[PDB]
């Protein structure tokens, strides 16, 4: 009841899953060498070739 942080294993498992998912969803904001990180913009800007 009083002492906290006695459940480190379950807590850190949850933290690991959440962190992996967050970095996966954050990876969507990278140019990867292209001109923009959003697909609709480059679709609407230039020629399909």
């Amino acid at each position: 009841s009083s002492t906290a942080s006695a459940l480190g294993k379950l807590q850190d498992v949850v933290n690991q899953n959440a962190q992996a998912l967050n970095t996966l969803v954050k990876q969507l904001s990278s140019n990867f060498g292209a001109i923009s990180s959003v697909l609709n913009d480059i679709l609407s800007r230039l020629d399909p070739p």
Partner: protein, 49 residues
């Protein structure tokens, strides 16, 4: 028209521009666009031209 070493710069803002007349006119020897498709110009909105 000014010299190449003293190229004349003009700023265009707060206007409604029709780029089609530029593509329609045949008076231009070279009409080369790099970041955008020439036919999509009327479909976009910019600032500080």
């Amino acid at each position: 028209f000014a010299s190449v070493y003293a190229w004349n710069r003009k700023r265009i803002s707060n206007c409604v521009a029709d780029y089609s007349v530029l593509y329609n006119s045949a008076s231009f020897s070279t009409f080369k666009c790099y970041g955008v498709s020439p036919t999509k110009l009327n479909d976009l909105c910019f600032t500080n031209v």
